[model samples]
Target: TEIRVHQGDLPNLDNYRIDAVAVDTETLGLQPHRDRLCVVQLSSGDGTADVIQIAKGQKSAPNLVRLLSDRDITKIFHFGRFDLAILAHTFGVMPDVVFCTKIASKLTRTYTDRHGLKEICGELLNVNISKQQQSSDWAAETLSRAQIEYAASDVLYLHRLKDIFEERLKREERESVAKACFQFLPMRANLDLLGWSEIDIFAHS
Candidate 1:
């Protein structure tokens, strides 16, 4: 399957509503600015997708919330905890259905160590993506062309990755297991923290 890349600002985002917002997070676990957000829409069964280059100046918590609300879409992401956390913190709303490949891998026992998206994509999707810019200052004004491309690529492969994982789950009759994993999404690290500690002091530390 070939991937298509589209470059533009927020005003050009109207044509695609059923879109997936694939984000690359900072080392501290925060979504890049709205301008840094690159959205993509996978044409149902077409094997082709469209990428939207979000400009930094146009990113706002409200705008993102609006985008998520407008689309009755399942966001396809890999290891989406931090990204979703950032969305909730920034936009004050969390999209309902989010599919995380890392969680799916965990359910299938395909994930063992720290599951980074690039590593998982390389192993499952045969795509190698670098995390060099992960620690870069995301608030910078003029981002380099290479930086944009790298960010876009992070999200562009997500839909295809979701498709692959979904097919595997269905074939193995593990759809219920996938649903179980979905139930674990909101609980995330909170469940473990609460179970291990008698007092919730981690937040203060």
Candidate 2:
């Protein structure tokens, strides 16, 4: 089945109301130049989607913070540690719940090492995602069609992927394992921050 995805610019981002924000690490890396961040949400039943671009440098980091604080909707991603780290570092907030397909892969022992989302999706969902534009300049003025398509594709498959993983987690009685892994995200971020503190200089000196 062909998945429906949406794309839009960050400047005209407030048109849609988003329950959650799904972002890529590269996008997070562009925070300095870009005043806002873009996110896409897929309609659960109809398979339709919409994009919202939110201004980043605000008093409260409201949009992104709201996205993180929301517990009703699950924020989904594949191999999301770096992305989560960037969010926490940039916005001082982490999503209340994160459903990572990479952790799921670890739990199932389906792939030996870290598996790329495209490979896993093709293996499990039989979908081919092009990676040609993944490393392109996301900070460019006008994003290319290829770039938009690539960005949208990242989160578009997440809902379905979550369904599959959740079922397997229950079957294997590893739901707690997944929850434990999710809880580790913030701790990892905290460790990184602590490791980079100025006090580290005193210890080394």
Candidate 3:
């Protein structure tokens, strides 16, 4: 697999204009409102991936924003709550037409409570990825080769995982609910940015 690292944004977003694409982000911290988004990664399920580094305090990424706003294409993410929040906060665009592997696993693979990307990949795809670089500093001006590979790996298998989860969701008769949850991701991120992230509005007090 080839990993291409870009500065700020992709030079040509059209190259990844496929039916479905895998997306992930690397941030300085968990909170998008304060931590700041550092890098965005995308893969077309091909043998290649793009890791775009957002320079410190740089926010305008027109091509990346355009791709995220394209309704015709589907965006696949793992644990999309964080990634979507980071993307929307960084790009000012709420990516729709989405499929989240983490959500699908939670809805379908109810046997075990392990729905993390590493666990999902290990169980479903028999692939083990290292997360050593996961908590590293993404705010670095020049990302190490390890950081690039780690970011690429984050997006590489998401497309396959989404397909697996989709099939499982269909078998479990939860596709509609899954779609509804995916459709609601944008609003969920909005709530996160609005500081209601920890509040369960639907629960009775």
Candidate 4:
């Protein structure tokens, strides 16, 4: 697997011709409003991770926006809620056609409550990864090799995990419901961005 780092946006459109792309984001904090998005990573499931580092206060990545909004492509994420919101807010575009492994794992893997990326990959793919740089300073001018590898790892395994969870969802007969949840992820992210992060409107009080 190779890691290709981009300055502010992806340079080539032909590099990602696949139908599904695994995407992930790194930011200063969990609160998108309080913290800025620092990095966007994408992998075409072909062993190459394209990592785009966003300059501080930089906005508008046309290539990234185009790819995200492409209806022909499916964006796979471990946890998509925050990424979708931050991507929309940062790039002025809303991505469609989503698949979230975390949601699928929750729907299908009822035996265990551990659906984190690391846990899922460890159990399903037999791959070990470190989350050491997960909380590191992503806003730094230069990303350490360790940080880049860590960021790349998050996206690299997503495609395989997606395949695993898809089969599990189908075998467990929860595919449609999982699809519904994936369809609702964009709005869920919107709710997080719109100050409804605390309340569940679907619950009857």
**Per-model TM-score on C-alpha atoms:** 0.67, 0.71, 0.96, 0.97
- Model 4, 124-174: lDDT tens digits are 879998998999999998999999999999999888888888888878888
What does candidate 1's lDDT look like per residue over 9-67, in tens digits?
23444545554554433323232232234332333323444434334434354443566
Ranking by lDDT: 4, 3, 2, 1
What value of lDDT does candidate 4 attain over all alpha carbons?
0.89
Best by lDDT: 4
* lDDT of each residue in 95-142, candidate 3, tens digit only: 878888878888988999987888888999899999999999999889
Model 1: lDDT equals 0.55
1 versus 4: better TM-score goes to: 4
Tens digit per residue, CA lDDT, model 2, 122-168: 87799998888676666555556676677667666776777788888
Superposed by TM-score, candidate 1 places the C-alpha of residue 59 at a distance from the truth, in angstroms, of 9.1
Candidates' C-alpha lDDT: 0.55, 0.59, 0.86, 0.89
Judge candidate 1 at residue 59 and give its lDDT. Answer: 37
Candidate 3 worst ten-residue window by lDDT: 8-17
TM-score of 4: 0.97
Off by over 4 Å in 4: none
Candidate with better lDDT, 1 vs 3: 3
